[PDB]
Scaffold this active site. Structure first.
Site, PDB file in Angstrom:
ATOM      1  N   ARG D  11      31.555 -59.016  36.971  1.00  0.00           N
ATOM      2  CA  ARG D  11      30.617 -58.068  36.323  1.00  0.00           C
ATOM      3  C   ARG D  11      31.230 -56.667  36.381  1.00  0.00           C
ATOM      4  O   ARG D  11      31.232 -55.970  35.339  1.00  0.00           O
ATOM      5  CB  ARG D  11      29.233 -58.134  36.980  1.00  0.00           C
ATOM      6  CG  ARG D  11      28.550 -59.496  36.862  1.00  0.00           C
ATOM      7  CD  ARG D  11      28.234 -59.938  35.452  1.00  0.00           C
ATOM      8  NE  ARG D  11      27.661 -58.868  34.634  1.00  0.00           N
ATOM      9  CZ  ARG D  11      27.738 -58.794  33.295  1.00  0.00           C
ATOM     10  NH1 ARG D  11      28.365 -59.729  32.591  1.00  0.00           N
ATOM     11  NH2 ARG D  11      27.181 -57.780  32.661  1.00  0.00           N
ATOM     12  N   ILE D  12      31.749 -56.233  37.530  1.00  0.00           N
ATOM     13  CA  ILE D  12      32.335 -54.860  37.583  1.00  0.00           C
ATOM     14  C   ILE D  12      33.662 -54.795  36.796  1.00  0.00           C
ATOM     15  O   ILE D  12      33.869 -53.778  36.109  1.00  0.00           O
ATOM     16  CB  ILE D  12      32.464 -54.340  39.024  1.00  0.00           C
ATOM     17  CG1 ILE D  12      31.129 -54.448  39.762  1.00  0.00           C
ATOM     18  CG2 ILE D  12      32.974 -52.909  39.003  1.00  0.00           C
ATOM     19  CD1 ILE D  12      29.987 -53.799  39.004  1.00  0.00           C
ATOM     20  N   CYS D 154      26.982 -49.106  44.368  1.00  0.00           N
ATOM     21  CA  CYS D 154      26.156 -48.621  43.216  1.00  0.00           C
ATOM     22  C   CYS D 154      24.964 -47.796  43.729  1.00  0.00           C
ATOM     23  O   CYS D 154      24.717 -46.682  43.235  1.00  0.00           O
ATOM     24  CB  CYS D 154      25.694 -49.768  42.332  1.00  0.00           C
ATOM     25  SG  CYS D 154      24.934 -51.161  43.216  1.00  0.00           S
ATOM     26  N   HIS D 181      16.092 -53.563  43.735  1.00  0.00           N
ATOM     27  CA  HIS D 181      17.411 -53.826  43.108  1.00  0.00           C
ATOM     28  C   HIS D 181      17.352 -55.096  42.260  1.00  0.00           C
ATOM     29  O   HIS D 181      16.759 -56.076  42.694  1.00  0.00           O
ATOM     30  CB  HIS D 181      18.476 -53.910  44.203  1.00  0.00           C
ATOM     31  CG  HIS D 181      19.847 -53.489  43.800  1.00  0.00           C
ATOM     32  ND1 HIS D 181      20.710 -54.325  43.117  1.00  0.00           N
ATOM     33  CD2 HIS D 181      20.537 -52.355  44.048  1.00  0.00           C
ATOM     34  CE1 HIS D 181      21.851 -53.699  42.917  1.00  0.00           C
ATOM     35  NE2 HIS D 181      21.772 -52.485  43.482  1.00  0.00           N
ATOM     36  N   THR D 184      22.027 -59.964  41.956  1.00  0.00           N
ATOM     37  CA  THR D 184      23.493 -59.963  41.760  1.00  0.00           C
ATOM     38  C   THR D 184      24.039 -61.344  42.069  1.00  0.00           C
ATOM     39  O   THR D 184      23.228 -62.229  42.421  1.00  0.00           O
ATOM     40  CB  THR D 184      24.164 -58.884  42.614  1.00  0.00           C
ATOM     41  OG1 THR D 184      23.916 -59.284  43.951  1.00  0.00           O
ATOM     42  CG2 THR D 184      23.640 -57.493  42.336  1.00  0.00           C
ATOM     43  N   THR D 212      21.110 -52.881  53.558  1.00  0.00           N
ATOM     44  CA  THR D 212      21.866 -51.936  52.711  1.00  0.00           C
ATOM     45  C   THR D 212      22.628 -50.976  53.634  1.00  0.00           C
ATOM     46  O   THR D 212      22.083 -50.568  54.659  1.00  0.00           O
ATOM     47  CB  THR D 212      20.936 -51.304  51.669  1.00  0.00           C
ATOM     48  OG1 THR D 212      21.793 -50.550  50.804  1.00  0.00           O
ATOM     49  CG2 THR D 212      19.845 -50.419  52.238  1.00  0.00           C
TER      50      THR D 212
END
Ligand SMILES: NC(=O)c1ccc[n+]([C@@H]2O[C@H](COP(=O)([O-])OP(=O)(O)OC[C@H]3O[C@@H](n4cnc5c(N)ncnc54)[C@H](O)[C@@H]3O)[C@@H](O)[C@H]2O)c1
Ligand SMILES: NC(=O)c1ccc[n+]([C@@H]2O[C@H](COP(=O)([O-])OP(=O)(O)OC[C@H]3O[C@@H](n4cnc5c(N)ncnc54)[C@H](O)[C@@H]3O)[C@@H](O)[C@H]2O)c1
Ligand SMILES: NC(=O)c1ccc[n+]([C@@H]2O[C@H](COP(=O)([O-])OP(=O)(O)OC[C@H]3O[C@@H](n4cnc5c(N)ncnc54)[C@H](O)[C@@H]3O)[C@@H](O)[C@H]2O)c1
Ligand SMILES: NC(=O)c1ccc[n+]([C@@H]2O[C@H](COP(=O)([O-])OP(=O)(O)OC[C@H]3O[C@@H](n4cnc5c(N)ncnc54)[C@H](O)[C@@H]3O)[C@@H](O)[C@H]2O)c1
Lengths: 338, 337, 338, 337
Positions: D11-12, D154, D181, D184, D212
């Protein structure tokens, strides 16, 4: 001596109330009627099959154009959008459960009394300060039979008030803010469509939708020491049921997470047993589906920053847990009835 | 040239404005929108779209009754009663009926009482005598003399063009179809009141079987297909794009490559922009914002026992249908008076 | 005299198998072991809490680094990605349930026998014609104890074969095609990512994803009269469990929907009781969640076009209903054991 | 000018190629991609995106080891071992580490053994001594002498810029945050194996609390904030866009309008393109494909008891973070040798 109940608005709340009540071992309520716009066919079908609650184990049948059957117990179904036409006098209706969400002020709610009903129990916050508001496990003791019209508050206020009470007694609260990350409701649109609130207008299962909440200020109705101390907002996310309150409070007495969890555990094993729960397993929203408690503290998430900034995360089933409170409050009116 | 009014600014009305606004050449001039929400709702929901994304266009509220798109103003009337609407005053040639409420000669008729000369219904007609058109199938039989017309349903617009190729090249004995359809506004978000006990059920949690007139409706634009096709819909948890699964017994024995070649002939020539043939192995979201009515999934084309043909065709039920709505309205422009 | 079972691959299928089996009133199976890569902590947690099945009512505990407890019954947990190291001889393991989905050919599956296990039961289609395939309610009678390695077929073939059998006997089938509108599986990616199949690569909860299926040709393994008569595909949609088979068959004997539903009802009340069900209520996918039957015919959806084109829509819980078949087939091996 | 290699086309990595390809002016020249799937996977997943939509660009497979975007070719190396990669041979200046697997000096170090001069990690550094940068906060302290750098997470890129304004204008005593969020790739689609028993749970069915480092990580780019901030994440069923909810006790007593004005000053001047202040009442999907790191929801800004500030900031965790990755790599271009 049981009391005769009518359910106004056979919605998510009305149907959850019936299944909550039906599953109680001992009750002083006897549901005899349901004002339902969709008649016996709708009420019988949506009562039996449910996308979140699942299929009702009880036997549901349509006896005739005015009645349904639940495990052989007959229930009258009527249909009037205008409450004044409801047959409350003729059916000797003691108590109404106002779950429509439209008849929540004293003028609209009074119409059920006007049509002959003895009492009304709003399944929501009332729209005027004149209607007394109760939260079971916090201030249900202050309910008097002389109160014709009562409020059981919001699902979020039912999650917030019991654990806020513990914090206020044990550490004392100066000020705070909350976020409810809340499952979508029937108020949100499925696809982008007309709504007075342009956020709630947006497709609910596609988006994180910010919305205003009165739960933070509403807590002051049941806990007068909280007046003006809390505010907050909600984020509606694409889950169909189960919600979580994220609370950040500044406390007077400096503390730590294990001390804050011990306070919640004392309350949970003592005077708030059945309403407040402390969960030590690392769970997710679905695991709190169909829980009877108003609030489940996520113990491992509790966080203290700089001695007096306390963060608590509390799970609540906004449909079922709230409905188990609505059955509880109605029982208090039955237990107090003259 | 022709002056257009949009009644009901929902998913199809808002898709229509964005589709029309995107045409390089347009004979249509959208002058009025009937929306209950007023300039503040219309401006906001035109600009922010959960499906379409943000309108690239400059959208602003000019005053109490006007919005501008890229500086062009549009009036926002707000009446639930079409008889009220000032279309004699605004000199409205054509009305786009995106409400889904005025579907018959009488309901649709009210716009013309109010001044409009013609009505285009973005849905099947409730009344038999109302002619229905599918661009790329029978829009040639369109005539100015028809005051109220129908652009059919989104599923019928996907089905009719490929059914047309099949009937020409192989001929259809009989057939059945299933449309695995994106959820719509009819459906409830959580279990609640609905005439259809299936559509009453939480839309984003379920596969929800529902009725479809889309199979029988093909006979309206292709009279040869009367009594040959039936089908159902399975509404599934996606916000847009749907896929038609058609199984037909045909007269002329055939094979997958031969059926796909017949579709490809139509795609490259007479149905360019209506019918596409897709070779890449895509998924529903890739068919988002496609202008074509029908996207044949070439690799899914199957033939069993020589004469049983299965075809799988994608369609954006919002955007592709809306591009056909723009196309039908354009045809009334080129045949006007 | 019960038989000792090991579960290889504590996935959606392995865990559903344990809860299916555990909930049986009378069984000839005794599960003693589970090869689980994530050890006791994973196996105990994911066994207790489940996003589709819900929370297991039974008592699950970690006894030590090698064992878990279900309602006091101890179960050995081991962890070897390579099956040859599994302690099947030492634990006197009669029967393995191969739910990994990797050891499904005769070479890989034999390794459990090689490590001392007596029999293997693949929770999937085998990858070679040499491994016999069974569908309960269709051809389980043909299973022999002499078969060391058996296949219980796909979830879809388990839905398809019982109702295909009825159509073949009653009307006779010439040719047909099927679509399974199937819930997403662990094989699909959550967000767009690496996969040998570029469709299955796409974000599962965002899309309708076409994929190949062997269920249409696989039916011929259990019903030899079907050889070469059916093909089809699947459409994976954003639901987590419950699937539906859409079948279009050309039949020899011209018929009508009520006649086709009567055939399914005869089978459902007779020899396919518990496997095939005919549903007359207008339900949706969630209502078929946790059903014990392999196939539920949606009676009102049955459609006949031009006398011999028949369309049947059949609901199946691809996790639970299939798991209730895997427990059934394993019982047949127990009932036949020498 | 500088020759860029992308390791891990997820994805990135795929967001990075589309972001970089969209810059009018770029000092970066992407010459190589390491993808296990080969030209056929890379070409397909670059072109079709469930979140981003179809790449407008012309994407084709040139041969066994090359793809072209708008005619520009890129080599597709396929090694799980970075030590194998031919970056001495391809003369690779900078490497973008989008794998999430080589996060430390040793793991990241392998690219430079293979010929690359510098490594840019699209994630927090596992090792303390690796400097981390947030464009619009501390990218000025960036130096060419740093061989391996981190662009942070992010969430840290959303938080750090607005925290920076708050610390300057009001000053921070201590604070807590929650990021609601988007799910992912770490998370499982259905309940399955995971070190994190919460991330093991079906991603699209649940609100999933998770840890996190984003709160403590802010202290890396703003040393004044050491030990002042903590937080958690609630992963929810959306594919992209997330929102930071920060509650901070501040030194200087203040009010909502005064906090928003401080953000607006930063938005209009020093943080233009990094920090935005949004006045319209939007939802997560409207923040899709925004280039800014942070979008303050102006109407949600709350001040209770004078010194407790709550700020709600949107961020596209894919696209906005990826635009910052392009920005950090560009900075190494303008400071190269
Ligand atoms: N669902 C929740 O999470 C939740 C939690 C607590 C509080 N509440 C409150 O409960 C109330 C109802 O919420 P819900 O989710 O059950 O909504 P719902 O939409 O599911 O229920 C409303 C029902 O009332 C019916 N109705 C509307 N007008 C009526 C009238 N005039 N006479 C009779 N019936 C009428 C509707 O047709 C529908 O069947 C609201 O005040 C809501 O804020 C909801
Ligand atoms: N959405 C699709 O996939 C699709 C595609 C093809 C055809 N259609 C047809 O398009 C039509 C519109 O569907 P939709 O999905 O946009 O529905 P929608 O609910 O999104 O749009 C309906 C709009 O009409 C307005 N409206 C309702 N009654 C009105 C009245 N009396 N006066 C004025 N405005 C009124 C509503 O407020 C709303 O804004 C329907 O006939 C539908 O069958 C749907
Ligand atoms: N879930 C369904 O709907 C369904 C239906 C019927 C058939 N099946 C079949 O069942 C099988 C498993 O499917 P599932 O959905 O349970 O998948 P899953 O991914 O949930 O289960 C697989 C499990 O096996 C483990 N595993 C992998 N390699 C292993 C090894 N070498 N040794 C031990 N354990 C190992 C994985 O880590 C995981 O825990 C597949 O063949 C599938 O086709 C699935
Ligand atoms: N996705 C977000 O929202 C986001 C934003 C900010 C930062 N990040 C960070 O970005 C990084 C990538 O995340 P993602 O969401 O794109 O994950 P992803 O799983 O989509 O991408 C990972 C890619 O790396 C490849 N890969 C794995 N091991 C490899 C190896 N040894 N050699 C070569 N390629 C290999 C995989 O095959 C895959 O294509 C992570 O460090 C994550 O923490 C994520």
């Amino acid at each position: 001596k049981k009391i005769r109940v009518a359910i106004n608005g056979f919605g998510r709340i009305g149907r959850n109330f019936l299944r909550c009540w039906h599953g109680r071992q001992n009750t002083l309520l006897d549901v005899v009627a349901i004002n339902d716009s969709g008649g016996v066919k709708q009420a019988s079908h949506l009562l039996k099959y449910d996308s979140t609650l699942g299929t009702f184990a009880a036997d549901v049948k349509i006896v005739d154009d005015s009645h349904i059957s639940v495990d052989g117990k007959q229930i009258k179904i009527v249909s009037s959008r205008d409450p004044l036409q409801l047959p409350w006098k003729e059916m000797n209706i003691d108590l109404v459960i106002e779950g429509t969400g439209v008849f929540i002020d004293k003028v609209g709610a009074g119409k059920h009394i006007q049509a002959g009903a003895s009492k009304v129990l709003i399944t929501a916050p009332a729209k005027d300060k004149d209607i007394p508001t109760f939260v079971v496990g916090v201030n249900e003791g202050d309910y008097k039979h002389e109160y014709p019209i009562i409020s059981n508050a919001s699902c979020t206020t039912n999650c917030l008030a019991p654990f806020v009470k513990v914090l206020e007694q044990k550490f004392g609260i100066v000020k705070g803010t909350m976020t409810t990350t809340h499952s979508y409701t029937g108020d949100q649109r499925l696809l982008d469509a007309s709504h007075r609130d342009l956020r709630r207008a947006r497709a609910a299962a596609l988006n994180i939708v910010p919305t205003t909440t009165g739960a933070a200020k509403a807590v002051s109705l049941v806990l007068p020491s909280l007046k003006g101390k809390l505010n907050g907002i909600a984020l509606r996310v694409p889950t169909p049921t189960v919600s979580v309150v994220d609370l950040v409070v500044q406390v007077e007495k400096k503390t730590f997470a294990e001390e804050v969890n011990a306070a919640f555990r004392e309350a949970a094993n003592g005077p708030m047993k059945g309403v407040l729960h402390v969960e030590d397993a690392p769970l997710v929203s679905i695991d709190f589906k169909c829980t009877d408690q108003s609030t489940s503290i996520d113990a491992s998430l509790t966080m203290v920053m700089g001695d007096d900034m306390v963060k608590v995360v509390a799970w609540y089933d906004n449909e079922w847990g709230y409905s188990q409170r609505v059955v509880d409050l109605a029982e208090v009116t039955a237990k107090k009835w003259v």
